[PDB]
mmCIF file of C-alpha atoms in Angstrom:
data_model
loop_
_atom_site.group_PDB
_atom_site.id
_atom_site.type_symbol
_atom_site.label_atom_id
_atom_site.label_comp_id
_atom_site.label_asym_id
_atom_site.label_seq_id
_atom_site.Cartn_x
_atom_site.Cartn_y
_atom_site.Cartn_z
ATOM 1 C CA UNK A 1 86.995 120.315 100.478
ATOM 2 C CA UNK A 2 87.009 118.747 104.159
ATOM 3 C CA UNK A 3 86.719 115.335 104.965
ATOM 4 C CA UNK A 4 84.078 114.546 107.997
ATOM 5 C CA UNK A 5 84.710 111.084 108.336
ATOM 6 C CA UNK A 6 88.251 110.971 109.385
ATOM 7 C CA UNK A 7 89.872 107.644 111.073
ATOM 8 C CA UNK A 8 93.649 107.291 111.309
ATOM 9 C CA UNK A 9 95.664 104.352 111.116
ATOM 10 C CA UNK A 10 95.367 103.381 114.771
ATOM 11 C CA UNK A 11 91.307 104.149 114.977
ATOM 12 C CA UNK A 12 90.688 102.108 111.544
ATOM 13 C CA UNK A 13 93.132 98.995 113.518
ATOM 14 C CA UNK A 14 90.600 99.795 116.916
ATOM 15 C CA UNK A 15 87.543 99.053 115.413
ATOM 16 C CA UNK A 16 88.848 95.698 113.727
ATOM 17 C CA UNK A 17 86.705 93.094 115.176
ATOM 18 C CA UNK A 18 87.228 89.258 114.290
ATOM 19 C CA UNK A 19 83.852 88.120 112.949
ATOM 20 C CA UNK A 20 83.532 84.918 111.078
ATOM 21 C CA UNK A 21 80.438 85.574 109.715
ATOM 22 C CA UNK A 22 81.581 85.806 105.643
ATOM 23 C CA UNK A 23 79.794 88.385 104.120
ATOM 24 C CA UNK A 24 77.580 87.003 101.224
ATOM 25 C CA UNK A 25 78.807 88.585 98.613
ATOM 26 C CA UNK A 26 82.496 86.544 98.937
ATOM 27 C CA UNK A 27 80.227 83.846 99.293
ATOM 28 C CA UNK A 28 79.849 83.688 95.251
ATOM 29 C CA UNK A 29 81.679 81.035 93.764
ATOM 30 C CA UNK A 30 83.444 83.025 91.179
ATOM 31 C CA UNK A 31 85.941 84.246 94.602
ATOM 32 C CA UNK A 32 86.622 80.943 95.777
ATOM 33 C CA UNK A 33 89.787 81.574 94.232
ATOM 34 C CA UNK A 34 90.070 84.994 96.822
ATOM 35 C CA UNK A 35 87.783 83.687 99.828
ATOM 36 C CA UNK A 36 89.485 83.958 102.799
ATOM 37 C CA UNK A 37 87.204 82.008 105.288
ATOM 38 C CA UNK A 38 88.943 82.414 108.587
ATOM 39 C CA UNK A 39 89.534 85.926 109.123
ATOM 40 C CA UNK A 40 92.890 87.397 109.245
ATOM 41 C CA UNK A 41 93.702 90.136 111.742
ATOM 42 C CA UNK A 42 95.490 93.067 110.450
ATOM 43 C CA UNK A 43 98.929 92.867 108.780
ATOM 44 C CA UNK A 44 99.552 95.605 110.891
ATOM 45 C CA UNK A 45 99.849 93.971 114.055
ATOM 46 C CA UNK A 46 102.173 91.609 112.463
ATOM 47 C CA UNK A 47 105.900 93.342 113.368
ATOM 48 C CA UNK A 48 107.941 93.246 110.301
ATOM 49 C CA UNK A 49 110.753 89.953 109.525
ATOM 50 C CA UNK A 50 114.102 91.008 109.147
ATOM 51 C CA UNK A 51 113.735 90.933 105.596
ATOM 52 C CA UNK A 52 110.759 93.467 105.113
ATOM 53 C CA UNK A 53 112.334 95.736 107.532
ATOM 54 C CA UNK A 54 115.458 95.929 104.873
ATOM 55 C CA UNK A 55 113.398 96.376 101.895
ATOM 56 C CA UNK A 56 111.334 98.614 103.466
ATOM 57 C CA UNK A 57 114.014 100.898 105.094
ATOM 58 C CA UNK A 58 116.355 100.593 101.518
ATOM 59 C CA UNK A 59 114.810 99.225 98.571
ATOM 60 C CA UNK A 60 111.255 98.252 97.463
ATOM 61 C CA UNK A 61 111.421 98.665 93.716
ATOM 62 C CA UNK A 62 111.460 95.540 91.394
ATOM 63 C CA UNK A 63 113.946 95.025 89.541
ATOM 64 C CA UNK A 64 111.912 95.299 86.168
ATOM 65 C CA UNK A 65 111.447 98.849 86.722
ATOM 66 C CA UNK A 66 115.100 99.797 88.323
ATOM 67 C CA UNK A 67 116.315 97.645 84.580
ATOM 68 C CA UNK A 68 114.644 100.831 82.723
ATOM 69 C CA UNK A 69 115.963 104.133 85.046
ATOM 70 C CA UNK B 1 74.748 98.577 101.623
ATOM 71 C CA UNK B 2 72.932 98.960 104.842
ATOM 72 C CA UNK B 3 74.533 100.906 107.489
ATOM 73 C CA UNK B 4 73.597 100.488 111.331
ATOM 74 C CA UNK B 5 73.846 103.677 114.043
ATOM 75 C CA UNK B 6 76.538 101.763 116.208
ATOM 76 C CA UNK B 7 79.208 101.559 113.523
ATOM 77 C CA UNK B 8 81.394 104.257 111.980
ATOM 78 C CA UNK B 9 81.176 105.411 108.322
ATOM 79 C CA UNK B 10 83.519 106.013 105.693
ATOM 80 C CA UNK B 11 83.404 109.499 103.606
ATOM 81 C CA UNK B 12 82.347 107.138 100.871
ATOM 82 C CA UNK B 13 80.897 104.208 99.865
ATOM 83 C CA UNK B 14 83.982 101.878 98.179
ATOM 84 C CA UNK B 15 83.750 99.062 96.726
ATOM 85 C CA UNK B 16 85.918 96.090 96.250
ATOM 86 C CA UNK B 17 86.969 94.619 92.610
ATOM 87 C CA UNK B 18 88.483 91.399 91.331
ATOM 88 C CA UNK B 19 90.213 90.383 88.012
ATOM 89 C CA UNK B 20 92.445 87.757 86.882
ATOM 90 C CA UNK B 21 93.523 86.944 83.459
ATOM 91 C CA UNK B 22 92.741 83.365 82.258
ATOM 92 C CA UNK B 23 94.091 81.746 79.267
ATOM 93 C CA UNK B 24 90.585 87.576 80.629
ATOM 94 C CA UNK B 25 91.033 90.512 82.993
ATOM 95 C CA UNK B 26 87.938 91.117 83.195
ATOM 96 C CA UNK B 27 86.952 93.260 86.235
ATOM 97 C CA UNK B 28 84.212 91.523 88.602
ATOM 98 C CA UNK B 29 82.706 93.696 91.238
ATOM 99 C CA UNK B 30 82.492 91.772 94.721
ATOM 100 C CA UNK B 31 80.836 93.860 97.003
ATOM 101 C CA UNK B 32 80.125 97.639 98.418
ATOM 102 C CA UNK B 33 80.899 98.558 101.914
ATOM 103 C CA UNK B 34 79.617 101.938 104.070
ATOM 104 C CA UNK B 35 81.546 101.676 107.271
ATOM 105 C CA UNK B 36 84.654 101.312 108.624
ATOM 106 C CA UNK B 37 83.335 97.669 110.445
ATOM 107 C CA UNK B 38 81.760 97.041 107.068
ATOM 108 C CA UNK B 39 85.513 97.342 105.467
ATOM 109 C CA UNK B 40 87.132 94.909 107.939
ATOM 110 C CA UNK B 41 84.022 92.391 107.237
ATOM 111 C CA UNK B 42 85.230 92.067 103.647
ATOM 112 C CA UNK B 43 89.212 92.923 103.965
ATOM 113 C CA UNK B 44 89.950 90.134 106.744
ATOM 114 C CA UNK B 45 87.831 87.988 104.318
ATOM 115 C CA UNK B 46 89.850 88.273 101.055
ATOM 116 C CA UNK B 47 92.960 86.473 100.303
ATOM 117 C CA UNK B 48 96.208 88.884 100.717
ATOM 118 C CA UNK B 49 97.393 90.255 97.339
ATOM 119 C CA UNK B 50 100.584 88.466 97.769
ATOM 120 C CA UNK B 51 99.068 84.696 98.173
ATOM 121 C CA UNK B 52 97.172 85.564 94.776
ATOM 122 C CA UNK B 53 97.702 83.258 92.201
ATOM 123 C CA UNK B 54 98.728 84.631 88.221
ATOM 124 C CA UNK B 55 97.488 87.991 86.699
ATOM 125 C CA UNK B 56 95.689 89.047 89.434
ATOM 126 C CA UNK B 57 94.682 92.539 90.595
ATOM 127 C CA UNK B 58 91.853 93.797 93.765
ATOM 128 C CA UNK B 59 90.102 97.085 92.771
ATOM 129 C CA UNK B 60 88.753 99.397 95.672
ATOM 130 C CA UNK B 61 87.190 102.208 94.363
ATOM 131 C CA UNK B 62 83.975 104.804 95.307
ATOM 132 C CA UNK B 63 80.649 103.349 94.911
ATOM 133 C CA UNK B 64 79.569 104.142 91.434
ATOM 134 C CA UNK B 65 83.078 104.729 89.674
ATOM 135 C CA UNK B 66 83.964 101.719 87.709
ATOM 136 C CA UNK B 67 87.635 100.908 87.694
ATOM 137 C CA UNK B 68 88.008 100.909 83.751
ATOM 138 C CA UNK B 69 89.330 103.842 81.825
ATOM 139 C CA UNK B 70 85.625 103.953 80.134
ATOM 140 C CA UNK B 71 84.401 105.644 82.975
ATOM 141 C CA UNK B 72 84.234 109.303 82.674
ATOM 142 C CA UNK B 73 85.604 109.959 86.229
ATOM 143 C CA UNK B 74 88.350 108.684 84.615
ATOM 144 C CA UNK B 75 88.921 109.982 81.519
ATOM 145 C CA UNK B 76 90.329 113.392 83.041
ATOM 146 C CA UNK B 77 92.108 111.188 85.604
ATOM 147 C CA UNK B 78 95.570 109.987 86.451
ATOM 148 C CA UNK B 79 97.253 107.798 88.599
ATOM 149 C CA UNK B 80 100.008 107.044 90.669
ATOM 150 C CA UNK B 81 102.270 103.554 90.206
ATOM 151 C CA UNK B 82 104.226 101.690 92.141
ATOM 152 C CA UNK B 83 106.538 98.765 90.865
ATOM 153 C CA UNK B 84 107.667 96.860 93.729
ATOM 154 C CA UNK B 85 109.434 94.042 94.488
ATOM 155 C CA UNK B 86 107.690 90.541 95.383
ATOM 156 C CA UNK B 87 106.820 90.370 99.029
ATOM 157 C CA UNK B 88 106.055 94.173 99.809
ATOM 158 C CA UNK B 89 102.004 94.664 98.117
ATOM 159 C CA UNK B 90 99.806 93.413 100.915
ATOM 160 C CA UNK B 91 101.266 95.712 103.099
ATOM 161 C CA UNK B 92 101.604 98.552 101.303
ATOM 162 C CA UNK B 93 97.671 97.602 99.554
ATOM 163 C CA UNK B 94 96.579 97.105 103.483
ATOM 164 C CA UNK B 95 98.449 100.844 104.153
ATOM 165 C CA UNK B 96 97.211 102.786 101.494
ATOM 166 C CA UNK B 97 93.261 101.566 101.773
ATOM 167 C CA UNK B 98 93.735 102.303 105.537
ATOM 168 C CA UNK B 99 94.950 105.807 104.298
ATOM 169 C CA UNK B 100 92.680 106.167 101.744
ATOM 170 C CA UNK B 101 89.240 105.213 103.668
ATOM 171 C CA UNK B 102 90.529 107.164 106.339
ATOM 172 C CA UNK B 103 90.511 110.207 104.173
ATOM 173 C CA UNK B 104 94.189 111.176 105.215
ATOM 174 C CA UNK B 105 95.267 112.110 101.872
ATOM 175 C CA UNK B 106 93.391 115.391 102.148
ATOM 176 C CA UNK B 107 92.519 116.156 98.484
ATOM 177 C CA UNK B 108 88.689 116.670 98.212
ATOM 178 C CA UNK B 109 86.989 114.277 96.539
ATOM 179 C CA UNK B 110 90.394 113.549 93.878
ATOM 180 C CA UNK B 111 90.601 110.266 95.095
ATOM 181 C CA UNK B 112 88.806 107.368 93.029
ATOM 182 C CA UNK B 113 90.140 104.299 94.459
ATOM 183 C CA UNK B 114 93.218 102.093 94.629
ATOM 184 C CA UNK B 115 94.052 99.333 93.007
ATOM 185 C CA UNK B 116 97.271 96.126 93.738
ATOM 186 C CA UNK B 117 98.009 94.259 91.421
ATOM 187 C CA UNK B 118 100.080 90.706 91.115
ATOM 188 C CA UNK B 119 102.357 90.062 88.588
ATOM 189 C CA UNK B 120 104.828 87.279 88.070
ATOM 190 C CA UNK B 121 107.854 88.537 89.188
ATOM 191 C CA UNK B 122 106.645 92.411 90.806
ATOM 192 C CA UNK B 123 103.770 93.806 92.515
ATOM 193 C CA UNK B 124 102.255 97.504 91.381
ATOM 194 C CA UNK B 125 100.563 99.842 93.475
ATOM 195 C CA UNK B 126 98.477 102.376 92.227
ATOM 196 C CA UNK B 127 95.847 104.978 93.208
ATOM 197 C CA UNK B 128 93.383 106.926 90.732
ATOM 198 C CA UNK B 129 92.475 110.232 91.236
ATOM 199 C CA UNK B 130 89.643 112.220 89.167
ATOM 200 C CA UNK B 131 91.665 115.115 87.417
ATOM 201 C CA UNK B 132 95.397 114.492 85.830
ATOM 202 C CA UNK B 133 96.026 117.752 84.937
ATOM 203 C CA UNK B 134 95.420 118.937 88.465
ATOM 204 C CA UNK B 135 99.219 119.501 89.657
ATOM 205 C CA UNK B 136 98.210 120.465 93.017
ATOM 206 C CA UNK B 137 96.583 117.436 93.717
ATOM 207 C CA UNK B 138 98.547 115.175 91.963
ATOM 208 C CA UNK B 139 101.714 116.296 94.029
ATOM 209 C CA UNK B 140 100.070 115.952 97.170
ATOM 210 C CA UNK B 141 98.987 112.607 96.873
ATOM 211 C CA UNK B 142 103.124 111.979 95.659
ATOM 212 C CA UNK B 143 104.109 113.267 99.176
ATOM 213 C CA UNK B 144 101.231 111.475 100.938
ATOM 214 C CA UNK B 145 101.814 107.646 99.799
ATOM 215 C CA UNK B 146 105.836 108.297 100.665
ATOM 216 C CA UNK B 147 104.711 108.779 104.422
ATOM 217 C CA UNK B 148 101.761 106.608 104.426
ATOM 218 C CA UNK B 149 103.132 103.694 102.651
ATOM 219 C CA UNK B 150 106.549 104.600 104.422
ATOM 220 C CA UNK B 151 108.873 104.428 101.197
ATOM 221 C CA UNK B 152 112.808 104.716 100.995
ATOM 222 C CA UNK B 153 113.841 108.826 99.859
ATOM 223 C CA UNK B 154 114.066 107.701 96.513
ATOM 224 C CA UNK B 155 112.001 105.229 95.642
ATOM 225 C CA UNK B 156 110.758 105.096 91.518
ATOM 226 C CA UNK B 157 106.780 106.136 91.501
ATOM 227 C CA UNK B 158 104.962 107.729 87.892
ATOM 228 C CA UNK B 159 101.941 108.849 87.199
ATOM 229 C CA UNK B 160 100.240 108.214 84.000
ATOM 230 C CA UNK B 161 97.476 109.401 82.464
ATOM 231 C CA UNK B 162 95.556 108.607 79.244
ATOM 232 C CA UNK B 163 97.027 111.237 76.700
#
């Protein structure tokens, strides 16, 4: 089967629009705890810290799981 | 979820889940989204995965699939895991819904959503797809979170199923 809504990384980051308008449904008080009421950009268009870049270029794994291999 | 002719749909419907165990886990649905402006209304509007407090897990899956092992689209199903190390699950979680509501995984209709959850001392990845015993697919969707979620050669991913 064949997808005909296709939108790669950079056309899903292009139509990323900052709108403070919350939608109501994270409005409910049982995701205060989630409720992010300033809206974030993309963590794509953050560039990565030294730090991620290692882990991401070596080793993301936990250690719980590399303690069983 | 009402959809307007200016913005761009998704494939599906999706729709975002929260849990977090409280001394229970118990899945709460938060909302269903059409388009790809829809998405980015409720994404840039939820806390990342890795400022979540406890046992706490998002759920993104299709409209209509419920993201418990009750449901029957998941019964047959399977999924892939990924056990990784604090700091590294809102981007990969940001990553793989991109991927997956982008429909670059290229499997049909396999997929059934994703799912990040936050542990004390790791982070796991997953995404569900609809039939386990399909090799083909289940391989494919391997290959495709290596390049989407860009991991190291040998990174440690399984994929469990319910027998």
């Amino acid at each position: 089967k064949l997808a005909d809504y296709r939108y790669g990384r950079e056309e899903m980051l292009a139509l990323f629009l900052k709108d403070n308008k919350i939608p109501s449904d994270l409005l409910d008080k049982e995701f205060l705890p989630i409720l992010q009421e300033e809206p974030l950009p993309p963590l794509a268009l953050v560039p990565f810290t030294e730090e991620e870049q290692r882990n991401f270029s070596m080793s993301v794994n936990s250690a719980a799981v590399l303690r069983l291999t | 979820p009402h959809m307007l002719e200016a913005e761009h749909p998704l494939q599906y419907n999706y729709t975002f889940w929260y849990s977090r165990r409280t001394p229970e886990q118990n899945i709460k649905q938060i909302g269903t989204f059409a388009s790809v402006e829809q998405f980015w209304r409720f994404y840039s509007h939820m806390v990342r995965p890795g400022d979540l407090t406890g046992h706490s897990d998002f759920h993104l899956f299709k409209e209509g699939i419920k993201p418990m092992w009750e449901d029957d689209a998941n019964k047959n199903g399977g999924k892939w895991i990924i056990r990784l190390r604090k700091g590294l699950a809102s981007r990969c979680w940001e990553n793989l819904i991109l991927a997956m509501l982008g429909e670059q995984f290229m499997v049909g209709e396999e997929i059934c959503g994703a799912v990040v959850s936050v542990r004390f001392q790791e982070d796991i990845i997953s995404i569900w797809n609809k039939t386990a015993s399909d090799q083909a697919t289940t391989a494919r969707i391997r290959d495709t979170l290596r390049r989407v979620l860009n991991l190291p050669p040998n990174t440690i991913m399984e994929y469990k199923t319910h027998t």
